[PDB]
Amino acid sequence: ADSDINIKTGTTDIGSNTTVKTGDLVTYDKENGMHKKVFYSFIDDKNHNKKLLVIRTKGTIAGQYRVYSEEGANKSGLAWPSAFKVQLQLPDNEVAQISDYYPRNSIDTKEYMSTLTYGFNGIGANVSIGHTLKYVQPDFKTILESPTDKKVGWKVIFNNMVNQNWGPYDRDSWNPVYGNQLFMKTRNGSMKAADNFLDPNKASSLLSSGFSPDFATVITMDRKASKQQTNIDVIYERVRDDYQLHWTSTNWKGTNTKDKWTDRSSERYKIDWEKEEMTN
Amino acid sequence: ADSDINIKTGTTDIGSNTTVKTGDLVTYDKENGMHKKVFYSFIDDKNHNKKLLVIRTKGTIAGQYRVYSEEGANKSGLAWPSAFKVQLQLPDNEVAQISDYYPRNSIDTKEYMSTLTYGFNGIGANVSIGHTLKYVQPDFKTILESPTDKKVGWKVIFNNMVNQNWGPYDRDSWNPVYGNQLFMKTRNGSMKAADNFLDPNKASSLLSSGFSPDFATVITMDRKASKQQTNIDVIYERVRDDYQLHWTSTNWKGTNTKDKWTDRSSERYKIDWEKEEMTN
Amino acid sequence: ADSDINIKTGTTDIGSNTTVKTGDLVTYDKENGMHKKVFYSFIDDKNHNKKLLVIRTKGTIAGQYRVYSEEGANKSGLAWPSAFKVQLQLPDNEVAQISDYYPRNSIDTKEYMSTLTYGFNGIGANVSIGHTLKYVQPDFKTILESPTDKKVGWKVIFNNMVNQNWGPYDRDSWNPVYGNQLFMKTRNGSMKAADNFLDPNKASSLLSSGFSPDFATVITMDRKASKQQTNIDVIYERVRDDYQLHWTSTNWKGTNTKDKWTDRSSERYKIDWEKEEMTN
Amino acid sequence: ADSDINIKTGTTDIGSNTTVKTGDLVTYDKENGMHKKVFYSFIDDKNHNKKLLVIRTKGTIAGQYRVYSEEGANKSGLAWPSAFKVQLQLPDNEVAQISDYYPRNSIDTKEYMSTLTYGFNGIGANVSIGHTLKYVQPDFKTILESPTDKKVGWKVIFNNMVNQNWGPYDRDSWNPVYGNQLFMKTRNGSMKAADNFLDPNKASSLLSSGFSPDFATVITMDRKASKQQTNIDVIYERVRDDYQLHWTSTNWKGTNTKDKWTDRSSERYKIDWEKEEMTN
Amino acid sequence: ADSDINIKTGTTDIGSNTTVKTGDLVTYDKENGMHKKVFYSFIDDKNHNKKLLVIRTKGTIAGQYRVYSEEGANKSGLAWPSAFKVQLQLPDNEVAQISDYYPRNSIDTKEYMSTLTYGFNGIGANVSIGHTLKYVQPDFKTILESPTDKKVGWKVIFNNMVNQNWGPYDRDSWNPVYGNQLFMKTRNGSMKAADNFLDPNKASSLLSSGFSPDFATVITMDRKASKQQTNIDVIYERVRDDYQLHWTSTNWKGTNTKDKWTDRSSERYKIDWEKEEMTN
Amino acid sequence: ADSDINIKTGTTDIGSNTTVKTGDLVTYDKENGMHKKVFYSFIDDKNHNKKLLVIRTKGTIAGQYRVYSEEGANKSGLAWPSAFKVQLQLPDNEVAQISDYYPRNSIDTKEYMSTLTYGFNGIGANVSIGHTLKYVQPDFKTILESPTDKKVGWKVIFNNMVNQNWGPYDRDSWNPVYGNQLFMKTRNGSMKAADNFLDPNKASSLLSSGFSPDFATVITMDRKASKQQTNIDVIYERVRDDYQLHWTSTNWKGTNTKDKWTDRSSERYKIDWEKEEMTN
Amino acid sequence: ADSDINIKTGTTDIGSNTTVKTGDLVTYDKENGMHKKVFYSFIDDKNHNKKLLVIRTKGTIAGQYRVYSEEGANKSGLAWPSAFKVQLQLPDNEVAQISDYYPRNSIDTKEYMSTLTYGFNGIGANVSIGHTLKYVQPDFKTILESPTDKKVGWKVIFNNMVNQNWGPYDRDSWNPVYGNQLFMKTRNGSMKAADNFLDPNKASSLLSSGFSPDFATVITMDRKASKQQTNIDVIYERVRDDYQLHWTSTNWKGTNTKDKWTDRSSERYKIDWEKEEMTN
């Protein structure tokens, strides 16, 4: 990248001959089961025209994948994490601005193949034309929500999943006979409904074992600011969907409702640029 | 590259034993939702015969993917980002010149395969001849617009997209029955038109979540210039297309109009070579 | 990662110009055959706002794959390791907190391919539509159990196995004629039941030769704590399943019972932050 | 390479413990739209027996892909860049010589596969013999023209292109019905001829957005030369082909004429070895 | 690994600013043809709380692949190395413990692919469902035998082999007509039995040319031990199988007997921690 | 390589703490169009027991691919470079010896695949056996001719080429109807013979644009030699084949004659070990 | 490897802060055409308990691929290199021992794939079961012959070769009609027998152009030995096979005889540990 313009590698980078004062802040929200981790670092370069503060948003959001309620032997429910989010807002009153952030949206790709085969038989000369298209489909998509001057956020959504090594079912899939089969253990089952759900081990790890974020947001502040202090708010949250299945006297049918429950864990941090330390 | 001519690696690069004064400038255009970031760096080498200034054009352009208007239950519209652009113009009056830039146009590639199979049966001896051709098709193409002495620009266009895991539709696709099906959720749908659009999550991330540029333009100025100051203009913009679909009493039909709306965000920066700092 | 924000590589890392006092603690639980290894390291940075202690949880858990009992020539049993676990709990009374941990849950992936071929014959014009989906299936899955402020744990489960190069059988597989064939050497066998089990060499290595963990948990403590001492508990364990097979007078039938035996090996370690050493 | 002869890496390279005086020279030929960039570097080693001067020939040649003229609604023309060239000549009078250059011609490669399958049916025993051959086909080929003592040149030619994801058409392709279909948007079109050309976005980037060279030519001069000064000439150029298509009352037909227009941009540079600087 | 917890690379490693006293000990057991090599190294860190001694168990075990005896022209035998082992035991009396070891058991993997193709003919609409599963099968498996506090061992077993580019035969394979064909040169042979064995060159190299181990076992000792001396025993061995084949008057038949001969080469080494040298 | 014997990387290499006096010698043979480049380097190590001199044989041999003569409209000829060579001889009188050289002969490789498929139909149970073999076929082979004490040489030969994306024709190919079709543009052509040759652009680059060698030969001389001077001869050459094609009144026929013309360019260099410089 | 035990990379390696006295010895055996090269290095570490001497066995063995004799126009012969060897023996009287050596035997690998496809037709429900197995087959195998305390040797054998892009023939192949076709240019040829052999260019390079070894053998000697001097013997050799083919009045038949000629080139070197130099 930088070496392609004939500039020596690392010349344009910053942080040289400086003393970065790092730190760490761990919080746990037992009500929502959302481990928090806000590792930061104050990079003060005399060459750079503004101060820096890279905020690492590590942590973990519990999957919370369990049957919330059961109604008899012919009806049951399941709540699973539809999407995890990590928002890092900054009051519009303050003069600090977010400079960069990572990861960011990337351009997809797909391979296209074309075929043209014709043969002869002894003579029924035939012709065949065919084209195939392939691409990768991650189970969860790390989408960077549109950032602005004071707010930056990420989200992880549910792309689709393969059930019992058959079919990439998704939230929008529907089958007139069986309905949505996203987490349906057996089709013509005879077992109790509450225990007719795909085992969490078979499902994706993030659904039950949780999602561990890893995001960065470097925020710069003017060096001649009147007040060297800016509070920041960091928000985690997960969105859960209710997956209902019931027996139609012939086979199980399953339905999924999108964005049923949403729980947000908000924390406020005070940054002291002069002291180069931010406190919980 | 450089090591192939027997020259020691990094010998021909510049920026050694020098003090680059980097910087940062963040602006947000809430009217157009276009985050801006003009990280720069002043590389002053005494060996090099001219001054340097590498301008990083980071930032983000919001996708702006939403149904702008709906007309009844049989007609609706959708505006999506057809192409993002980043232009970095320089007044022709000034004597500074752009030296390099990155990324640049690259040569495509494709694999070609040929087949020749003939067998016998017991005897209907047959012969088969076939050839296949495959290549990668990115959803968005990063095309570097033709640069000149005072102006350099980039653009990102819409190559094509795969809808519902079926067919790489593009802006020019047309089907006599259904028309352009670029963002058509369902063919024989019975739902309201305003809500018959492909979910933004299913579509590419750049359409709704925005595009984050990353470009570089090193501009050099004569060391004995009469005036050590040159203002520069940096322009972001996105081009949106209107995607109309209506019901023909039998099935949905969709049409796409190219380059319907264009919104440009222009900023002017003043560069002070003597002070080695450029201000907003 | 860090270099993408234009920050020099390693600037935000910690541990510079400091003297880490490492160590080692080896224990063997001959009753359960679980080798233990708690290599640690005390990273005390004056820049960092808290002390650090990275605990490596190396060791080994014996597979314990043997025929526990046999009942005649028509019935036998087999106990195999269903899942290994490594838990690192910390008393809620103490003020130390776990900061990070590794490895962590990762997002799966799968390739999707679509085909569309139509030809002509001389004319029985045919059409073919087909799609294939492929993905990797590790025998054992390293799932990170939901962590919290005081407790972090890992587990390794039995995804599935290929028997005699035919079929990826798993714990839930069932065949009405033969039943679960997870470890069935021969279908229409005539040998003694106790010796009709898949040879441990043919099976996966972890089943019989054991599993060697490799996990890390960095725990940070406030620098101004009233008492510089916190005891910690580290737990290994394995879960074994009973695999019964018997003769139905026509062919062997096998059944598997999940989570039959569980054996836990617990050790308590005292950490002395002031001395920078933790003793068994 | 060098390490395979047991010689320490970099021992045989040059440029150590020396002060290379680099530089830069930017010119723009608005008449032909050919950005120029002649970044150089004077490597003076006391160990090496001759002076060195590596000339980087960066820049850009505009694609110039547009419909030059239209004659009614049944005839039109198109001029596209057939091949870009970069020549670096040196007067035969001077005593300086070109030592090395990069890139250089490389040996192609291809995979060959052979098959032999015979089966039986119950018995019409058949036999099948088949072989397939695959290789990569870049759209543009970077051919290094035969160099000599005083002249070195490169050229980039048009290998072939894939049109509408169907067929790798080239300049020599011909079809009796439709003719050369290199840039034919539609076969049985009914639109005006001037607007029946493949969209430049669909075509390769280099055709319309231009080609950015990157070449190196190290030239050495005797250290005891009578005069320490040698002027050099650097030439860019592009060759354009006229692509005519007309309507035959039943379908469009297209023809291509090779090497219709050629425009050369020549610049002369004076090198001062004693001063270690070359001026425009 | 270590860099993922934000810790600088190599911070948690040991051996810095210390003087390791390495060594070497070569022995040859001409009776069993087992070259021995016990390269060691005494890593004494003042920061580490215990001494270290990494024992490299290099060497070589001869294949010993030859026809041990022949009985007429219709019966012959062959002894081949079924499995190589390397054991490093330590007397239970001593207080030294093994800390780590390498290589260790690794989790296998396999790719699973599913297909679903249905077409139409003009109309005999057909449907096709198919799934394929692929995985790698090394000829020899390096299994780490269950380690303990005082004993660590490795073994290399015979997974399977491909004979005459046809079939991956193994020790358990059986064919009612020909029997086990692991090393059967020809099926309907007419040559003497003693010379009807697969040429050792065609077979795997390890069978005849031997196996060269490469293993490591770091053992730590308390720094305040009463006596600074611990003797160690290192054992090599190979297990050979007798492969008998005889003529049944119509075709050759081969049978394999497992673990026929076992030869162990044991050596005892005395370690002097105070002197930092261990003698044969 | 060296690190596998536990020796620190680069320990056994030479050239440390020494001053290598490099150089350069450029010659051009306008009669044969063979650019020459003999970059050298005198590595004098006091630890090494002999002097060293690595001779780089860079340069370029022009392709010389043109129709040498035409005889009417039914006969024509073509001369193309059959093989390039680079020989570096040393007089047998001198006491200097060649120590090493690079590149060297490498062992080829090929993948072998075997298949065995049998199915049933409802029942015409069939069986299919098939095997495929694939390998890479470079157009030109870099063969190192057998070296000796005083002479080392390389050669590049014509393996085969693919013509019009159909068939890998070679010098030995023959077809009874059309003959050798190595460079036959059209089969049933009606154009003049002199202009019925494959365009040089379509052919391989080395045929017309030339071949650029890159070879190394380190030669060592006794340190106590009576005379510190040894002259050396370096020879380039190309071998050209005459490709004749004529019309048989029905179709073109082509024939190739091997090794028709050979042109050698020889240069003699005098080496002065005491002065550490070799002159043209 | 070493870093996995938490030991810093390179800690356990040797050769630090020491002065290795390298060397070189070149010999040529014109009688057998076997270039010799015995580059060595004396690594004397004060930490290591024994001296070291790594012997590089570079060189080259000429292929010697030519028709040794011809008997009329219906019989001819060909001698080709069946296998190259490099032996490095050491007198049993001396006390020096070989410590290590490289390369060493490696474990092969192969991929196994299984298929199971069943479809329906409208209904002739069919079932298909198939498995494929693929692996790489180098033309020449570098087998390390069983080493011992005083002797270490390598050999390179002839695995198999592909003739005319058809069939991997080997020394053991036999066809009742044509016989062994290893080097048979044409089957139903009518040319003289002496000139009916596969062109050496088409064959593998090592057969005619020779094989260039690259082997290492580090030998250690006790530091308190009574005499600091040990002579060593290094042996090259090649084994040639006689390939006879004759005409049976209908087609060519070829036969191969294994190990017809063997030529050994032996050299004796005297090592002076005290002087740290070994002389020819």
Report the b/e string of G33-44 with b at 16+ CB within 10 A. Answer: bbbbbbbbbbbb
User: What's the per-residue H, E or C state across G223-250?
Assistant: CCCCCCEEEEEEEEEEEEEEEEEEECCC
Q: For residues F12 and D6, is the Cβ–Cβ distance under 8 A? A: yes
Distance between CA atoms of residues D48 and E78, nearest Å: 66
Distance between CA atoms of residues F154 and F57, nearest Å: 11
Q: Which of A70, A81, A69, A67 is nearest to A197 (CA)?
A: A67
Q: In sequence order, what are the residues at sequence separation of 6 or more whose Cβ sits closer than 8 angstroms to the Cβ of residue D233? A: D88, D89, D90, D91, D266, D267, D268, D269
Residue F96 CB neighbour total at 10 angstroms: 24
Q: In sequence order, what are the residues at sequence separation of 6 or more whose Cβ sits closer than 8 angstroms to the Cβ of residue D280? A: D25, D27, D267, D269
Q: In sequence order, what are the residues at sequence separation of 6 or more whose Cβ sits closer than 8 angstroms to the Cβ of residue D190? A: none
Report the b/e string of E62-99 with b at 16+ CB within 10 A. Answer: bbbbeeeeeeeeeebbbbbbbbbbbbbbbeeebebbbb
Burial of residue C142 (CB within 10 Å: 0-12, 13-18, 19+) is buried
**Helix or strand holding residue C191 (H, E):** none
What the block records as the tokens of D20 is: 């290379």
Q: How far apart are the first and last CA of chain E?
A: 38
Distance between CA atoms of residues E222 and B227, nearest Å: 74
What the block records as the tokens of D120 is: 């039986």
How far lies E108's CA from each of D122, E101, E135, in Å? 40, 20, 9
- Classify residue G8 by its DSSP letter: P
Distance between CA atoms of residues C269 and C217, nearest Å: 14
Distance between CA atoms of residues G262 and G83, nearest Å: 10
Burial of residue D107 (CB within 10 Å: 0-12, 13-18, 19+) is middle
Residue A205 CB neighbour total at 10 angstroms: 21
Distance between CA atoms of residues D176 and D174, nearest Å: 7
Distance between CA atoms of residues G165 and G169, nearest Å: 11
Is E132 in the F-facing interface, judged by CB distances under 8 Å?
no
By three-state DSSP, how is residue E158 classified? strand
Q: For residues F243 and F68, is the Cβ–Cβ distance under 8 A? A: no
Distance between CA atoms of residues F5 and G56, nearest Å: 12
Distance between CA atoms of residues F205 and F218, nearest Å: 30
Count CB pairs under 8 A between chains D and F: 169
- Classify residue G5 by its DSSP letter: G
The structure tokens 């070189």 sit at G24
Burial of residue D121 (CB within 10 Å: 0-12, 13-18, 19+) is middle
HSE of G52 in the Cβ direction (CA atoms, 13 Å)? 33
By three-state DSSP, how is residue D91 classified? coil
Q: For residues G90 and G218, is the Cβ–Cβ distance under 8 A? A: no
Residues 204-233, chain F, touching G (beta carbon < 8 A): 220
Distance between CA atoms of residues D150 and D93, nearest Å: 10
**Helix or strand holding residue G271 (H, E):** strand G252-272
A168 preceded by cis ω (within 30°)?
A: no
Report the b/e string of G175-214 with b at 16+ CB within 10 A. Answer: eeebbbbbbbbeeeeeeebbebbbebbbbbbbbbbbbbbb
Q: Which of C160, C185, C195 is nearest to C67 (CA)?
A: C195
Q: For residues E39 and E23, is the Cβ–Cβ distance under 8 A? A: yes
Q: Which of G204, G206, G218 is nearest to G57 (CA)?
A: G218
What the block records as the tokens of A68 is: 């919330």
What the block records as the tokens of B112 is: 């070609």
- Nearest chain B residue to F37 by CA: give it: B5
- Nearest chain E residue to F130 by CA: give it: E166
Q: How many residues does chain A have?
A: 280
By three-state DSSP, how is residue A135 classified? strand
Determine what percent of chain D falls in helix, strand and coil, rounding each to the nearest 5.
Answer: 5, 50, 45
Q: In sequence order, what are the residues at sequence separation of 6 or more whose Cβ sits closer than 8 angstroms to the Cβ of residue E33? A: E61, E62, E64, E210, G146, G148
Give the alpha-carbon dihedral of A213, A218, A221, A223, to 10 degrees: 140
D168 preceded by cis ω (within 30°)?
A: no
Q: For residue B211, what are the β-bridge partners? A: B61
Q: Measured between beta carbons, which residues in chain A are less than 8 angstroms from residue C128?
A: 130
CB spacing of A14 vs C3 below 8 angstroms:
no
By three-state DSSP, how is residue A117 classified? strand
Q: Measured between beta carbons, which residues in chain C are less than 8 angstroms from residue E7?
A: 13-15, 43, 52, 54, 218
Q: For residues C189 and C196, is the Cβ–Cβ distance under 8 A? A: yes
| Domain range list for chain C | 1-280
Distance between CA atoms of residues B119 and D116, nearest Å: 10
Q: Measured between beta carbons, which residues in chain G are less than 8 angstroms from residue D130?
A: none
- Name the residue facing F119 among G43, G127, G139 (closest C-beta): G127
The structure tokens 């022709």 sit at B92
How far lies G255's CA from each of G101, G184, G238, in Å? 38, 10, 20
Distance between CA atoms of residues F101 and F216, nearest Å: 5
Q: Is G127 left (phi over 0), alpha (psi -120 to 50) or beta?
A: beta
The structure tokens 């690079």 sit at F102
Is B110 in the A-facing interface, judged by CB distances under 8 Å?
no
Distance between CA atoms of residues D118 and D128, nearest Å: 6
Sequential DSSP letters for chain B: -GGGGTBPTTSS-B-TT---EE---EEEETTTTEEEE--EEEE--SSSSEEEEEEE--EEE----B---B-TTSEE--EEEEEEEEEEE--TTS--EEEEEES-------EEEEEEEEEE-----EEEEEEEEEEE--SEEEEEE---SSEEEEEEEE--EEETTEEEE-TT---TTTB--TTBS-SS--S-GGG-B--TTTS-HHHHH-B----EEEEEEETT-SS-EEEEEEEEEEEEEEEEEEE-SSSEEEEEEEEEEEEEEEEEEEEETTTTEEE-
Distance between CA atoms of residues A193 and A69, nearest Å: 11
Q: Which of D114, D121, D133 to mutate to test the interface with G (most CBs of G within 10 A)?
A: D114
Backbone angles phi, psi at B246, to 5 degrees: -140, 165
Q: How far is D63 from chain F (nearest CA, A)?
A: 21
Is F39 in the B-facing interface, judged by CB distances under 8 Å?
yes
- Nearest chain E residue to G158 by CA: give it: E201
Is E118 in the F-facing interface, judged by CB distances under 8 Å?
no
Residue B93 CB neighbour total at 10 angstroms: 8
Burial of residue C93 (CB within 10 Å: 0-12, 13-18, 19+) is exposed
Distance between CA atoms of residues A116 and D162, nearest Å: 14
How far lies F155's CA from each of D78, D100, F29, F88, G207, in Å? 46, 21, 19, 12, 16
Q: Which residue type is seen at G1?
A: A
What the block records as the tokens of C205 is: 């290595």
Q: For residues B229 and B271, is the Cβ–Cβ distance under 8 A? A: yes
* Beta-strand runs (E) in chain A: 21-22, 26-29, 34-37, 40-42, 50-51, 54-56, 59-61, 75-76, 79-89, 97-102, 111-120, 126-136, 140-145, 151-158, 161-163, 166-169, 216-222, 229-247, 252-272, 277-279
- DSSP H stretches of helix in chain G: 205-209
CB spacing of E6 vs A39 below 8 angstroms:
yes
Strands B59-61 and B34-37: antiparallel
Distance between CA atoms of residues G47 and G17, nearest Å: 10
Question: Which of the other chains make 3 or more beta carbon contacts under 8 angstroms with chain E?
Answer: A, C, F, G
Q: How many residues does chain G have?
A: 280
Backbone angles phi, psi at D4, to 5 degrees: -75, -20
Distance between CA atoms of residues F109 and D132, nearest Å: 18
By three-state DSSP, how is residue E27 classified? strand
- Name the residue facing D114 among F12, F133, F142 (closest C-beta): F133
- DSSP H stretches of helix in chain A: 205-209
Topology classification of domain B1-280: Leukocidin-like (2.70.240)
By three-state DSSP, how is residue E205 classified? helix
**Helix or strand holding residue C208 (H, E):** helix C205-209
* Beta-strand runs (E) in chain E: 21-22, 26-29, 34-37, 40-42, 50-51, 54-56, 59-61, 75-76, 79-89, 97-102, 111-120, 126-136, 140-145, 151-158, 161-163, 166-169, 216-222, 229-247, 252-272, 277-279
Strands F126-136 and G21-22: unpaired
Please tell me the experimental approach by which this structure was elucidated. Answer: cryo-EM
Q: Which of C144, C43, C149, C45 is nearest to C102 (CA)?
A: C144
CB spacing of D35 vs B4 below 8 angstroms:
no
Q: For residue C65, what are the β-bridge partners? A: none
Sequential DSSP letters for B31-73: TTTEEEE--EEEE--SSSSEEEEEEE--EEE----B---B-TT
**Helix or strand holding residue C206 (H, E):** helix C205-209
Q: For residues E5 and C54, is the Cβ–Cβ distance under 8 A? A: yes
